[PDB]
Structure formats: C-alpha cells, structure tokens
C-alpha cells in the first residue's frame, strides 16, 4: 500500500519475488504507473534473479535484497523521488504477472 | 591387477564441488579387460527444474578411437553413437576436459581433439557415475572459473604419499602461460610444475638453499593445448611414481621433499581446470 517516511528514513513498497537462476535473469517493474510488459512510466531501476542488478543509495533496499527483496527502502528520499511506482512480479512462466499500482511518497 | 595403489577397482568419487566450469572430468589410469561402455552421467537442471536438455553423458568402448557424447532430454536416453576409444586392451585411459560453459574437451589416444559443448545455464550440473569394470587409479570431478591470474592454494599433498594424486591445470586455448605448481605455502620455488603448452612441455625444477638439481624433464607427453591436463603423481610402495598420459613421466627422488608439497601460485591466463581432493 501507501507508507510515508522522513528524510533519509525507512520507505516501504510490498512485493516481492524469487530468486530464480543464473540463466533464467528476469527483471521487475520499477519506476512509475502500470507496466504492461514494459512501462510503468520514467523507469527508474531494475533488478534481476540470482543477485540484485541495479540499485543505489537513493533507490536503496534495507532488507535481504540478493533473494527477491526489491521493495526499495528509499534512502534519502526527496518528493522528485516521490509518487505512484512501479512494482510488478514476473513469474517464471506465461501470463501470471500482478501489476501492483502503489503510491510510495516521502517528504 | 598392476600397481593400482588408490583403490580396490572399479572406482567411482562423487563431486568434489558444485558445478562451476572451469573442471575436468577424469578417468586417468589403466584400464581392466571388461571396458565395453560406461556411464558418466552430468545432468541438468536449469534453477532446480531437473530435466532439461542435458550437457553431458559420457562413455568409452575400448576399440577404435573417440568417447560419445549424449545427452538426457526430460528422462530419455538421448543420441547414443555406436564408435569405440582407441587404446589397445592393457594400456591407459585418458579422459581430459577443458571445462568452459560452451565446451568439454574430450580426449582419445592420449591427446585432446574433440570439444563437447555446453547448452545450459551455468550451476546446472548435478550427477556423476561410472559404469562397468573398470581399473582405477584416479577419478575427480570439480574445479571452476578462476579469474585470471589468482592466488589460491592446493588442497593436501601434490604427490600422494601412498596414493596418487592427480594434478589438474589448464593448457587454455586462449591463455598464456599454464600451470598449477607444487611448493610449500610460503611460496618458494620448490617444483615449479608446469604443464605450459604455449612451452609444450612439463617442466618441473627444484630449488634447495641456492642449488638447482637434476631439472627432471622429458616423459611421454603427445597431449595438446587446450586441453584439462590430468597429470599424475603416484606414490608407490617400491619408488615415488610421476606418470603423464598413463606412462610414466619421470620418478620423483628427494630434492625438496615429498609429504604435502601442495602449493598454488597463478600468474598469467590459466583459466584453472582443477584443485583436487585426494
């Protein structure tokens, strides 16, 4: 759902994945609104499977982010970071993805 | 029934690791009078999905030159081939994989000439075995990649004292210079072993307080760059045996010692093919 934070303060957006392989890499939605197959708009980041490919201190992840964590604990959030954002599962497999349209604002 | 000294034959060793390329898979030594056909089996997977098309499975008929290549393919017997390895009933067996993830290197009559290649995702290899009657000196399976130079160590010995203990280095199609050495863990020179095939050779030399020795050179050795080497160091009850492709290399007498002369330095392009269990 909607979380709020502080500046520099723990952020929240709930979803989550497995870690699949190390042949079978599969990015997620991030960034901003609904990606079909791909575009939730301004895409901000992406990740991966077997480690986690992309993300920063202003796209920062608190939790065991190496299997599947990509709910972005933002880090040093200003309201330019702020808004809807992109988070979408992509299942190994045909049709299963949930498009999670989900507000993530922080001061 | 010659100088077996490892095993009471037929032997098998399940993996040392899990797969990484970078390995050689080995059956080195004799063989028995019964060799018809074996199973190396590698299986796939692709995360855990254990049944995809499969890299490996190998077997030797011991008449006529070449090891098969087959495969499993969602729990059927694969592409099979009916041809035959070419040693003569008595001598040596050679088995010896370049490892990458795009090519196995197989080898028949002492020399590395056909490359069996990977399909699959890269940790997906999970099986081994052996089968038939077989005469065992040394079977290993594990290794991976290692980035270029590195600095790691060799497990127990080197030469085996007691046993044999084969040394896997890698003579790389796109290296530069090869080896896995045998010294101490301080990292003098002790013997500096080196099978360099940009050098075409096994060179090993003995360092002892100033003094350099015998420089022990020139065993049977027709095995070629790019290959898995599997170069075998025995120890016998009567003589402290150094064999290449099955024949004897050289003997080992006292220069530096024996009794866990294991020490690995890597320098240059050696993408190594194995550090090995006893």
Redesign the interface.
């Known amino acids: 759902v909607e979380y709020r934070a502080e500046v520099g303060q723990n952020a929240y957006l709930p979803c989550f994945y497995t870690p ?5 890499l599969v990015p997620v939605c991030w960034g901003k609104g609904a990606c079909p197959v791909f575009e939730c708009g301004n895409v901000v980041l992406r990740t991966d499977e077997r480690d986690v490919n992309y993300w920063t201190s202003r796209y920062w992840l608190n939790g065991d982010f190496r299997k599947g964590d990509v709910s972005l604990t933002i880090e040093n959030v200003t309201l330019a970071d702020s808004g809807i954002y992109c988070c979408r599962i992509q299942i190994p497999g045909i049709m299963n993805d949930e498009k999670f349209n989900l507000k993530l604002v922080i001061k | 029934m010659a100088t077996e000294t490892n095993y009471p034959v037929p032997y098998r060793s399940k993996l040392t690791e899990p797969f990484e390329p970078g390995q050689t898979l080995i059956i080195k030594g004799k063989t028995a009078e019964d060799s018809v056909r074996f199973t190396i089996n590698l299986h796939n997977t ?2 855990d999905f254990s049944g995809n098309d499969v890299p490996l499975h190998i077997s030797v008929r011991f008449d006529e030159g070449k090891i098969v290549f087959n495969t499993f393919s969602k729990g059927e017997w694969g592409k099979e081939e009916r041809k035959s390895n070419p040693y003569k009933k008595g001598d040596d067996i050679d088995i010896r994989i370049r490892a990458h993830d795009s090519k196995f290197s197989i080898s028949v009559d002492q020399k590395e000439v056909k490359e069996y290649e990977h399909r ?5 290899v999970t099986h081994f075995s052996v089968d038939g009657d077989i005469l065992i000196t040394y079977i290993h399976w594990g290794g991976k990649y290692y980035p270029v130079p590195y600095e790691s160590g060799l497990a127990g010995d080197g030469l085996a004292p007691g046993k044999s203990l084969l040394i896997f280095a890698t003579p790389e199609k796109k290296g530069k210079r090869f080896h896995i050495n045998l010294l101490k863990k301080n990292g003098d020179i002790a013997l500096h072993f080196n099978p360099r095939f940009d050098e075409k050779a096994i060179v090993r030399n003995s360092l002892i307080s100033g003094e350099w020795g015998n420089e022990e050179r020139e065993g049977k050795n027709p095995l070629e760059k790019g290959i898995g080497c599997d170069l075998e160091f025995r120890n016998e009850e009567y003589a402290f045996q150094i064999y290449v492709d099955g024949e004897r290399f050289a003997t080992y007498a006292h220069r530096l010692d024996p009794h866990d002369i294991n020490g690995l330095q890597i320098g240059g392009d050696v993408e190594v093919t194995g550090i090995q269990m006893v």
């Not at chain 1, 699949?20 to 079978?24: L, Q, R, S």
């Not at chain 2, 699959?120 to 997906?124: A, D, G, I, N, Y």
Request: charged share 0%.
């Open positions: 699949a392989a190390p042949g079978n | 692709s995360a699959v995702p890269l940790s997906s």
